[PDB]
């Protein structure tokens, strides 16, 4: 039923085997290691709720503003075992941090001392006594709240994780009758802020019955190798990220540090949160298979906090399919395929048995025809409820309902994606969120693609985004650049002539920034939306002025 009478049953199966891992790189650049048992975690997560019942009731909501690591693990689970609505959040670096605490209007906050020093009560798990030897007030309905202009909380019920977790597992582990191996161990270094990493890392060892191998995401960054290590521990890995951290790790991982590697164990890896870029997929793939990685672990995925995280992934037991689409046809609005390496390529995503997905014309609330470019909508138990407490953005995200449905397709509630994709053969594919695109002359251009361009020139990161003026939308691209007069024009005009002969496009603005200009999360690509309204009032800094 709910996630803390799955950990009791954890409990209950096997009491000392290792559930939680955490490497921290923080002071030892090797990483000291820390693990609990599930017995151990178990305590420390009656602790927590004992003492989150001293300040807040149930269904209260409980924020945690703790930094990675097995703190924030038990902070979250005593939060669900004390039946309040948890609210996972990052630790202070904010604004966005004070809005959603607004938001969510939490009865108690769960911290550690260490960031206690950056109203309701505030808790230092830390300075708990968390490993002294019942609080069972779960609920059985909404577990916690997932945040992502006005901060909206998603809700997201037990219900949602165990069907969301049911789809994965079987598209996962098809291969295998839906049963995932003996050796089976989750590796991961997603923020547990965020879905993909709060799902993977703190839920999934403890609904799947396996232990989990952490990290932070600044360990990641510091020096990508360490992933691909964690992966080759003992057992079969299952893990995941966005395309940049492939990219990432492609790039600046030494085969050094990779001495000795069995990659040829690891089960999984997810590719999602962001565009999936064949080539990123073929040059991850092809440095790093030496070590033995197999082909048919990188498993493309697509999702969206809205739908717990999982909407539909790759064909298990083979590798990605890749496709080929003409580009002027698809900024047209149609996909016509054609011959291998010609047009733009897309991931092929098999349409899903559950949840459902459906193109649908955003303008008419009627299903596209096969090849025709509409709004990816999603139906299924997985999809969430609506909002926290804002009952028309609600209606406006999850009330889509479909006007003389195809047969056999529901009538609703829909869950509009805010995403742009078609259907081609019986597998659909993703161009890219709504609001990005790049109209010119009636025609739509994903500045995924356009950034995909820039950056095989450029090697570092990008943002093609759209600017109005007096009418219509205008093409700039923020391009870092590593950091003469003469060098920069070439770059200039390399990039502007690159985007003119593969896109048609003639670039407005070309920015060269310094690396690091560019708004990105520690799992977000790049914020596009962020780049408009810096480069609007002017906060940028360029190298060739
Ligand atoms: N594959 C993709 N291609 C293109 N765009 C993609 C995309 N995925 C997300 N996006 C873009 O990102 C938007 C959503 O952003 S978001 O709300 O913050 N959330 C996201 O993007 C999260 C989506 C990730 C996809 C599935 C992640 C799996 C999670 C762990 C499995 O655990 C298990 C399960 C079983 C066994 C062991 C472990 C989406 O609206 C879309 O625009």
Not at 318 to 335: M, N, T
Not at 438 to 452: F, K, M, Q, T
Not at 464 to 492: C, H, Q, W, Y
Request: glycine share 8%; hydrophobic share 40%; net charge negative.
């Amino acid at each position: 039923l709910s996630i803390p009478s799955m950990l009791r049953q954890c409990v209950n199966l096997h009491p000392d085997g290792t559930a939680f891992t955490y490497i921290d790189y923080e002071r030892d650049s090797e990483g000291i290691s820390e693990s609990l048992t599930w017995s151990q975690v178990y305590r420390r997560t009656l602790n927590v709720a004992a003492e989150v019942r001293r300040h807040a009731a149930i269904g209260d909501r409980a924020v945690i503003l703790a930094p990675q690591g097995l703190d924030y693990i038990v902070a979250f689970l005593g939060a669900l075992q004390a039946g309040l609505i948890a609210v996972p959040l990052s630790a202070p670096l904010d604004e966005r941090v004070d809005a959603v605490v607004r938001d969510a209007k939490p009865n108690v906050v769960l911290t550690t001392s260490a960031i206690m020093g950056d109203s309701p009560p505030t808790v230092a798990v830390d300075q708990l006594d968390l490993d002294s030897p019942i609080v069972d007030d779960s609920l059985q309905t909404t577990a916690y709240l997932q945040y992502t202009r006005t901060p909206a909380g998603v809700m997201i019920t037990y219900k949602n994780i165990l069907a969301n977790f049911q789809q994965m597992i079987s598209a996962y582990f098809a291969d295998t009758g839906a049963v995932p191996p003996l050796d089976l161990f989750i590796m991961s270094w997603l923020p547990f802020y965020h879905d993909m990493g709060l799902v993977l890392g703190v839920c999934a060892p403890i609904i799947v019955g396996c232990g989990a191998v952490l990290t932070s995401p600044v360990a990641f960054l510091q020096r990508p190798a360490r992933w691909l290590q964690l992966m080759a521990r003992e057992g079969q890995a299952f893990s995941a990220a966005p395309n940049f951290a492939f990219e990432l790790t492609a790039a600046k991982a030494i085969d050094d540090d990779l001495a000795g590697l069995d990659l040829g164990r690891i089960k999984t890896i997810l590719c999602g949160s962001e565009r999936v870029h064949p080539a990123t997929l073929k040059r991850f793939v092809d440095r790093f298979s030496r070590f033995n990685l197999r082909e048919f672990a990188i498993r493309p995925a697509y999702g969206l906090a809205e739908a717990t995280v999982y909407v539909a992934t790759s064909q298990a037991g083979q590798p990605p399919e890749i496709r080929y689409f003409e580009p002027h046809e698809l900024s047209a609005g149609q996909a016509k395929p054609c011959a291998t390496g010609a047009g733009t390529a897309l991931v092929s995503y098999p349409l899903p048995q559950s949840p459902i997905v459906r193109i649908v014309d955003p303008n008419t609330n009627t299903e596209c025809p096969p090849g025709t470019i509409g709004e990816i909508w999603v139906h299924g138990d997985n999809v969430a409820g609506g909002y926290w407490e804002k009952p028309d953005e609600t209606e406006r995200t999850f009330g889509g309902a479909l006007v003389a449905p195809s047969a056999g397709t529901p009538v609703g509630p829909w869950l509009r994606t805010g995403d742009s994709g078609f259907v081609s053969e019986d597998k659909f594919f993703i161009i890219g969120r709504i609001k990005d695109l790049l109209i010119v002359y009636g025609r739509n251009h994903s500045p995924d693609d356009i950034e995909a361009t820039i950056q095989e020139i450029t090697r570092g990161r990008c943002a093609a985004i759209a600017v109005p003026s007096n009418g219509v939308e205008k093409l700039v691209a923020i391009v870092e650049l590593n950091n003469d007069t003469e060098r920069l024009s070439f770059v200039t005009r390399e990039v502007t002539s690159a985007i003119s002969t593969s896109h048609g496009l003639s670039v407005s603005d070309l920015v060269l920034v310094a690396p690091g200009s560019i708004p990105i999360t520690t799992s977000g690509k790049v914020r596009r939306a962020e780049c408009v309204k810096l480069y609007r009032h002017n906060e940028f800094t360029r190298l060739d002025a």
